[PDB]
Write a protein that binds this ligand. Structure first.
Ligand SMILES: C[C@]12CC[C@@H]3c4ccc(O)cc4CC[C@H]3[C@@H]1CC[C@@H]2OC(=O)CCC(=O)O
Ligand SMILES: C[C@]12CC[C@@H]3c4ccc(O)cc4CC[C@H]3[C@@H]1CC[C@@H]2OC(=O)CCC(=O)O
Lengths: 133, 131
């Protein structure tokens, strides 16, 4: 198992586990999370969430007042043990029965130490589905 | 209006299928890097990708020579930036002599402000290829 694979798989288990300290242990001090890439609700300036404090906030905000599934549909290794891509499905269910889902490509890059420097999501609000119950 | 990233991605598969080398290079920024795949492999010998129009020209030549290359987009994943996009692509080679070669990967593309490809990056390796 490559470092990029251990890291990305560990990052889904830690959100499954709602395990904030284990999630942050996976991150480099210079981590940038672009979920999604570009200006969006979860990326207000289009530039990403930078550094472990900010990314901790991101974790805290995301796991609050909703059930947050991340399923790996498919994995695409590259030829670098430090970079990898996956198709993931994300489901949040907030209060009253709401309900957002998105399916995206996510790419991950780790440093020489095995820690996440980048996580990048290809999705936008037009691809997201809303529901009730 | 399709995004600059999507126009560029779709044009690059059209240029390849038309064996249009000048069309293909007109899509590229002068600082273009192509990592097909990311990391060391037959098509990325030093692992840092193919850099610049001249080198990316040579890449085009080597991939289409004696080859019936089809590039089929199975699925497209826009981002929230009109300059970055990802696709699942099936790259199918049928060389002269009849020998088949195939890979299905994730490819990401980035364009600059002019709409020219700065990056093209493939998530595949030789262990994923079929024959
Ligand atoms: C955009 C969201 C789903 C839609 C929600 C939403 C939907 C409609 C609305 O009027 C307000 C809000 C506020 C919170 C909004 C959510 C914040 C994160 C969530 O979407 C993400 O979990 C998708 C994947 C990810 O960013 O990890
Ligand atoms: C199939 C190739 C690796 C993938 C290249 C390739 C990769 C992507 C693409 O869009 C087109 C092509 C056409 C040329 C393709 C190469 C021709 C020979 C090369 O494969 C060999 O290095 C290994 C062959 C074998 O494992 O038997």
């Amino acid at each position: 198992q490559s470092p990029a694979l251990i890291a990305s798989q560990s990052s889904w288990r830690c959100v499954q586990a709602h395990d904030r300290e284990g999630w942050l242990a996976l991150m480099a001090d210079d981590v940038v999370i672009e979920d999604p890439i570009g200006k969006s609700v979860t990326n207000p300036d289009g530039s990403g969430i930078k550094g472990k404090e900010a990314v901790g906030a991101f974790f805290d905000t995301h796991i609050a007042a909703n059930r947050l599934t991340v399923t790996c549909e498919e994995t695409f290794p590259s030829s670098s043990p430090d970079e990898i891509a996956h198709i993931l499905v994300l489901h949040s269910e907030f209060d009253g029965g709401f309900t957002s889902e998105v399916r995206g490509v996510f790419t991950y890059r780790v440093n020489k130490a095995g820690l996440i420097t980048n996580m990048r999501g290809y999705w936008n609000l037009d691809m997201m589905t809303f529901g009730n119950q």
